[PDB]
Design a protein around this nucleic acid. Structure first.
Lengths: 126, 31, 153, 115, 65
RNA sequence: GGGAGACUGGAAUUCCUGGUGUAGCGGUGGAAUGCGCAGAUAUCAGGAGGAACACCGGUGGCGAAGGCGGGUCUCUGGGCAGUAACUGACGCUGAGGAGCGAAAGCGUGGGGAGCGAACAGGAUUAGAUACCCUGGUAGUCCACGCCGUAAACGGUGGGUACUAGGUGUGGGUUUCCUUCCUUGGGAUCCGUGCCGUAGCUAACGCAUUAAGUACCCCGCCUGGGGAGUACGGCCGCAAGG
């Protein structure tokens, strides 16, 4: 997994840490990752309690996955971003194991939006 | 009542039972 | 098409042949709005067919259309959270559209050095039942038949 | 042999259907299965496969001299009506329809529920 | 709804010997008919069910023909 | 269908034997392990065995609670109604204590069809110590004993008296429409539901089966974790309580 990091201003070593942390998420993605971008920014105002902002974007086989966090320094922001991305990838899975509980089951028990409608005869049962 | 309290109690109970299982022979030999 | 069907465009009859089908054909071969070139191509192909066989071109064009017109097609259907290739009956208009599109495309990938010649050869072989469009109808019917188990929904 | 009157047994489960034309004494003279007519896996639980199996079995009974048959349907409904219709349509006269599905009087434990 | 033909002053006694009196109370499959369809009282329904079971036990009624 | 014992019935599953009979069967969202070609699955006849008792059968009955329905017989407990013959306050509660107490589990001896923790493969998955599939041992069953816990819940201790009604349903006595066939209707006693006043409650709701109005007795609570844990003790074969 190849990641490009577009930082700004002063954030020494943030790029390497972010690359190494984010690149570990490829195995979690159930489909090949086409692109991955990370941006690190810092807030100019000292009054901001969490100045560093980290954002990510992954192209998981055409599905866009993005997250954004805030932290007090580069390392914390990158770690929180990794956590958020992992959660998103978990919720995105869409393979069989991820949609086996949502497929309608039974015959008459339970009803869902895509549940098969019951077949009805022309004449009333009586 | 929320099931959260039941969850806390059950985790404490499960951990204690695991601890008891892990040291059965040691307790028998010391007692 | 969420709120209902949309009206169809009533295209006019052709002047030099008086048939709906040739206008449909010229609109199928039309590219970039150069309608005059499309009409020249279609008329040239019809005249080539008339010269080769010696009879009216519209009758052989209709014969080719009937030879390549499909009747059964396959569409992916999602019923109860599962997708399958379900054979579906084809309406007459969609069958004519599919036949014309197949004819035009398969003539576009012929090897007769000119689109008029390619089109004429394709329509002639479709009339005689040897075109690649005829073949394509054969495989589409075969695929529709091979999935007949799913026709119940 | 020559068996003019016989019995047809149709077993329609949730993933297959088996037809066996039977001499009234219980001997089987011709049988066709859903997987015997070219279907496999989930494909053979379809009513079309039931129709094909019924027609194949009906023919294999017909050259044996079977002209009139009575059916004994059985199992959860998958292609039972289709199978009977295909039996009739293949040149076989269907006398009587009887549903003989084994119904326990609360004996033996069913397997645990799937999830 | 309907009438408990046994609570009446002419209510015939329920026995496992009289087969026809029970045959009128079982469906064509040989199953015992429900109380709401039959309409008799709870005690008579119990008497009928017990009589049907007893008759089955002595091969007077089929076990679900 | 309150409990205990003995005997006994039929359907179905499995297995075994013998016919007919062929090339698949089985399983899934889709498949594969698996079974079969040494004759499977299917169909028919016969046989063996174990377990659970379709319809009746319900928000219906019984039991202090756990719980209890295939049939018959034997032994046995409680409840309700009416008469009010009898005794004449003999009542209520109950610390400790004793007994009973689902399932799982434990001991000894049998039994073992189906199901099935553990365990094996197959599949899904990034990974599957899982869900799904094929097998499958303890166990589930019986006899005799241990254990003594449960969302053992109505999350509502027991007794008593009083406080609008309406409407289902189970058991029993009775007056009048009266055909007296009929849930005819009423009255009454004992249950079991629903809806609803007053009242109560933080609210939700409860509401003559009170969570209302009061009296008697018992159990328990005193912020959350640490912790129903350590230590000591008692009980238990152990698990553990």
């Amino acid at each position: 997994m190849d990641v490009d990091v577009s930082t700004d201003g002063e954030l020494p070593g943030a790029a390497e840490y972010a690359r190494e942390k984010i690149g570990r998420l490829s195995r979690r993605a159930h489909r090949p990752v086409l692109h991955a971008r990370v941006r690190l920014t810092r807030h100019g105002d000292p009054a901001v309690e969490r100045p560093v902002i980290a954002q990510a974007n992954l192209d998981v086989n055409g599905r866009q996955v993005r997250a954004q966090v805030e932290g007090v320094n580069a390392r914390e922001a990158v770690d929180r971003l990794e956590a958020r991305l992992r959660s998103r990838l978990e919720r995105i899975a869409e393979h069989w194991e991820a949609r086996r509980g949502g497929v309608p089951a039974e015959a008459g028990r339970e009803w869902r939006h895509e549940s098969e409608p019951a077949r009805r005869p022309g004449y009333f049962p009586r | 009542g929320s099931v959260i309290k039941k969850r806390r109690k059950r985790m404490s109970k499960k951990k204690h039972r695991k601890l008891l299982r892990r040291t059965r022979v040691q307790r028998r030999k010391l007692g | 098409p969420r709120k209902g069907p949309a009206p169809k465009r009533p295209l006019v009859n052709d002047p030099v042949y008086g048939s709906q089908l040739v206008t449909q054909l010229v609109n199928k071969v039309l590219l970039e709005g150069k309608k005059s070139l499309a009409e020249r191509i279609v008329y040239g192909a019809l005249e080539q067919a008339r010269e080769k066989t010696g009879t009216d071109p519209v009758v052989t064009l209709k014969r080719a259309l009937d030879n390549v017109k499909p009747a059964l097609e396959v569409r992916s259907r999602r019923v109860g959270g599962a997708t399958y290739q379900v054979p579906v009956e084809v309406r007459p208009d969609r069958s004519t559209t599919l036949a014309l599109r197949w004819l035009v495309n398969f003539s576009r990938q012929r090897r007769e050095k000119t689109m008029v010649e390619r089109l004429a050869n394709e329509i002639l072989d479709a009339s005689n039942g040897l075109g690649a469009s005829v073949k394509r109808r054969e495989d589409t019917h075969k695929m529709a038949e091979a999935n007949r188990a799913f026709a119940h929904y | 042999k020559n068996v003019p009157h016989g019995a047809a047994h149709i077993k329609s489960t949730f993933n297959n259907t088996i037809v066996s034309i039977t001499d009234p004494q219980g001997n089987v003279i011709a049988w066709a299965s859903s997987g015997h007519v070219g279907f496999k896996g989930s494909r053979k639980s379809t009513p079309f496969a039931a129709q094909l199996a019924a027609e194949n079995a009906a023919r294999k009974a017909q050259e044996h001299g079977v002209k009139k048959v009575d059916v004994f349907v059985k199992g959860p409904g998958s292609g039972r009506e289709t199978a009977i219709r295909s039996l009739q349509a293949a040149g076989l006269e269907v006398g009587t329809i009887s549903d003989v599905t084994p119904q326990p009087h609360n004996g033996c434990r069913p397997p645990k529920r799937r999830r | 709804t309907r009438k408990c033909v046994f609570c009446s002053k002419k209510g015939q006694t329920i026995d496992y010997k009289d087969t026809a009196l029970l045959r009128t109370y079982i469906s064509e499959r040989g199953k015992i008919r429900a109380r709401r369809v039959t309409g008799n009282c709870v005690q008579h329904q119990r008497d009928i069910a017990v009589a049907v079971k007893n008759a089955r036990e002595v091969a007077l009624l089929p076990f679900g023909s």
